[PDB]
Design a protein around this nucleic acid. Structure first.
Lengths: 614, 637
DNA sequence: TAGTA
DNA sequence: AGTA
């Protein structure tokens, strides 16, 4: 038990009016698919006045009825709907009932933006305000500020989050900037709004003879909107959406905007000071009481004992000291670039196996996926020759492409590890890990974790980066202390999540000759918790207990020590079954226990220990 | 069997197309806002219509036979809630050749549309698309049966109009679903919109008040139609929960006042003289043809007659020569092996049905081979335990499972087969209501079970084009993303397997599915025969567009594997009648350079047979050779 | 089949 | 909140 500072700040409690927002019913025309309703009301909230937000399938507003735009239209994905709001008088909400308070926070959050607008002599993009300018150049003008956020606490009061930030601003414009010449970037942005894209390559075609699906020209599309009012920037550029990147879509460099002395980033003490400042400065135009730094009781997590042949501090050092369990191994390499094995990889593997007195064979893959039958053939031969797992050096492939390859391998019963080829040696973190995986998948128990945890099976699900398992998905899973399992991949989202877990569960009944008593499921919060409904219902019919935990890297906030320094692994409890996890300024992991009858500390310890060994 | 037999098709030849119709007007279209690329074709079909006249979709534009001045060059559209605006750009006249499979398909679309336009302007007669219903046959309160014929009009590779005619009857309802139900008639299966021809699956009625039932975004269900002026002159009635039926699981609301029950022969009752004997059918199709012919103005209909060859019957043989596959069950299999079969009873009891145990015990006895008749005492697919009982069974040597189960949805059927095949257990379905004296169904089911078990029941004579033939199926679905199954036959009976797309991840490109299904069959064939097949026969369902096999074909080419891609359609094959005398069983009727019919009566059918239309799309093999192999594969299984 | 409710 |  220790005391810590969170980058939050309590403000005044909400008054009785704010706890009793106005509600509004909505009618749309034409009626959209029920799955589209919610994103649309959110849009309806913007169309309407300000400090108004979506509530249920209606709206909730903090501002007077006579200020909202009760009628109009909104366009979404090219389609246009007519909306109409209907007042129905104030409705009370409890800050204490997750649901209702989601609204209050949404309201709270919209307000901040509304208040952030009025502030002048400073520019605000969304919730990110910017005071002092950090640089100035022919096009770049790095400003200094912080990303903000405002919400409601279970107490029923305001809560401000503050965190120092940068912003590389380009006032040049793609074509121009690409014009007095620079190398095209990876991610670009438009000129008419805030939506960002990933630059795929550049337009070798004519932007007026290049027709979109309808048959409309790329130029006419934008021209007939007002975006071409003599803003000629008119070179063609092939862009792609941050979501689902091959489907590539055409755009215009002249209607885009890209993304040596140095303020990279300040220390901990400096940032926690710069943050405590803005809380005072922003508390100025906020007029919501006087900021109060939030103290949170943080618990000290136990450092786990790892065992290779001899004690070891990290799994990586097992590659020099030796593995916990050894066996005669055969590992083949598949190269999707050039040649044989890079020297430092052959070396370590030899070193590590020497140090374990185990025999090691190193094959090399005689084929490439593009030869059809031959490939499958090669894999079977290699599988026959004792190959127990495959290492794959390869240029960066799309999520979809690798899953596919691991499947051609998996069908020839070949576990695999994918090491991206522009191999950066000096990046040991990377390749030392790639090898641990390869070894774990080959069946080697590199390190043993001395334990005391509820889950004998922890499976983590992957959807790439999508907010859904619609387009198939993938799962990785370990048998508790040391038993990396047969990681899988697989229509309807619920049915997807379930097969993933069905197979893994099955792999484990294969190894342990018994079903796991309990399972720990880890997933990204970006995916609706409901997609797991079927898997959980399935686990129940089996009697398999479980705990469902949502994960989210960025968005945790910040943790600062009172006066000393922060320990290696920390556990910070929060508002209702939510808690932070901090390891080794650092970035916390925000976690949520959405289902399961297991204490948060137990869970915290098991995730942390799972984190310790990559 | 080599003799030729003249035969009359229910087709008729019309004047050749004049130069003008060989050079339709072409028009470029443009849509705003740009829709998803997968909506462009469905939308152009809509533009073709909005534009009016005899105009059809051609590529990414239109093609028309009516004067360009008659078209509606500008208008709006709506496709599933979403709406867009279109503008046409007349780009002159452009020639098409009947010899080219693609261009000919377009000219025929124009013809089909021509038939529609002429039918739509007919006096006192009833039209339901390409169908015409001329006269009454019975009526009674609110309903009325009409008899006419569904028709078709297309162009040939020769370049002349061809008219198809087949008598049909239609039962029309003269009132609303509200009226009909008010007067006591039962709940029909399917309902049609009153304001258009869209139909639906009626699920049930609802107690909710239309006036206050809210559609997704909040609009009342009543205001939805009310505003669309569909209410003018009607009564909304009560709420009717309806289904797509392409999305049979999701209910949408509707209203009885705006619905018209789609009546069936059952609904009416009151043995109502509706069924046409082959003789009466034939004279009626000639009579209607004469009729539509005068109204069509495309010359006089000359019934098309063709040469129908009787294909050579296959030298079938198990342990010794045989007249039919099921005979091997008692004379012994062509080539036996130790065999293990497990029976999975999803109906209600315990074992092997006495008559099934007998045939099997006897079949193997005649073959002189060891057999084990297992029984899965594992419950239906309920639990990871089931997955376990299966793994155990395969480990213990089972080679195939016989599933005795009540009829399954074909989704649930493919699921189960997927579970089992997983664990390496092939399968054969046999629907539960089974009775001793139903020799035809179960003797065959037993043959599939054995063929799948790796057991070669019967072998076909010899010398066929392909030594490996694989069929593809997407079950109704017009593409191989959403599902995909394939069955491979070792050519001359060496039965290979059954399978479907393994487990990969992410959106799937059809060409990759198709490729993988074949990819698997080749390995099956590999392991089971020692080498890759020299030539393969790929049979696909016509509903699907052949573009999806491109990757697959290029792969075979790369591999050094020859092929022939033939597409099958049990629909629109027309009819076939004798000119005189009666008609045999396995007939081969070639029609064009690359198309033929295949007929097969059996028992002695009083009705008329619907032949199978087959189209040779890729390949070098003669049609006759291809018809033999397919025909022989059909009987064998 | 051109066309949610 | 807002395809190209």
């Amino acid at each position: 038990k220790t005391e810590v500072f969170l980058n939050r700040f309590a403000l005044r409690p909400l008054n009785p009016e704010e706890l009793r927002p106005w509600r509004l019913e909505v009618v749309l025309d034409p009626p959209p698919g029920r799955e589209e309703v919610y994103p649309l009301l959110a849009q309806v909230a913007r169309r309407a006045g300000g400090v108004t937000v979506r509530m249920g399938d209606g709206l909730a507003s903090w501002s007077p009825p006579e200020v909202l735009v009760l009628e109009g239209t909104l366009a979404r994905m090219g389609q246009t709907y007519a909306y109409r709001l209907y007042p129905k008088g104030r409705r009370p909400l409890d800050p204490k009932d997750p649901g209702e308070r989601s609204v209050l926070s949404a309201l709270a959050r919209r307000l901040l933006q509304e208040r952030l607008r009025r502030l002048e002599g400073v520019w605000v993009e969304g919730l990110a305000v910017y005071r002092r300018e950090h640089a100035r150049g022919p096009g770049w003008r790095v400003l200094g500020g912080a990303v903000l956020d405002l919400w409601v606490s279970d107490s029923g009061a305001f809560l401000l989050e503050v965190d120092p930030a940068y912003r590389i601003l380009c006032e040049m414009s793609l074509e121009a900037w690409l014009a007095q010449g620079h190398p095209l970037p990876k991610r670009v942005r438009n000129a008419y709004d805030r939506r960002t894209w990933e630059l795929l390559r550049l337009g070798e075609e004519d932007p007026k003879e290049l027709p979109l699906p309808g048959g409309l020209s790329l130029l006419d599309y934008h021209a007939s909107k007002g975006r071409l009012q003599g803003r000629e920037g008119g070179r063609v550029a092939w862009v792609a959406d941050p979501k689902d990147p091959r489907k590539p879509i055409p755009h215009l460099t002249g209607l885009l905007v890209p993304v040596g002395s140095l303020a990279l980033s300040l220390p901990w003490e400096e940032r926690r000071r710069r943050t405590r400042e803005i809380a005072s400065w922003i508390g100025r135009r906020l007029g919501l009481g006087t900021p109060e730094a939030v103290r949170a009781q943080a618990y000290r997590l136990s450092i786990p004992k790892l065992m290779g042949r001899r004690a070891v501090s990290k799994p990586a050092d097992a590659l020099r000291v030796g593995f916990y369990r050894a066996q005669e191994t055969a590992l083949a390499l598949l190269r999707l670039d050039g040649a044989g094995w890079p020297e430092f990889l052959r070396r370590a593997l030899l070193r590590a196996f020497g140090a374990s007195g185990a025999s090691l064979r190193l094959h090399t893959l005689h084929a490439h996926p593009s030869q059809g039958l031959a490939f499958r053939e090669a894999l079977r031969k290699a599988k026959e020759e004792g190959v127990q797992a495959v290492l794959v050096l390869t240029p960066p492939m799309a999520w979809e492409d690798r899953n596919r390859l691991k499947a051609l391998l998996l069908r020839e019963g070949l576990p695999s590890q994918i090491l991206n080829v522009p191999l950066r040696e000096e990046e040991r973190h990377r390749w030392e890990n790639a090898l641990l995986g390869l070894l774990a998948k080959a069946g080697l128990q590199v390190v043993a974790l001395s334990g005391a945890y509820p889950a004998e099976l922890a499976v983590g699900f992957d959807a790439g980066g999508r907010e859904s398992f619609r387009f198939g998905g993938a799962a990785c899973a370990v048998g508790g202390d040391g038993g990396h399992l047969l990681w899988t991949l697989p229509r309807i989202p619920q049915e997807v999540v379930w097969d993933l877990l069905e197979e893994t569960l099955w792999a484990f009944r294969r190894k342990a000759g018994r079903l796991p008593s309990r399972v720990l499921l880890l997933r990204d919060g970006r995916v609706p918790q409901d997609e797991f409904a079927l898997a959980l219902e399935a686990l129940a019919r089996e009697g398999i207990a479980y705990d469902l935990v949502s994960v989210r890297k960025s968005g945790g906030g910040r943790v600062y020590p009172v006066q000393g320094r922060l320990a290696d692994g920390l556990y910070v409890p929060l508002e209702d079954k939510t808690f932070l996890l901090l390891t080794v300024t650092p970035r916390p992991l925000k976690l949520v226990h959405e289902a399961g009858d297991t204490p948060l500390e137990a869970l915290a310890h098991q995730i942390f220990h799972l984190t310790r060994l990559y």
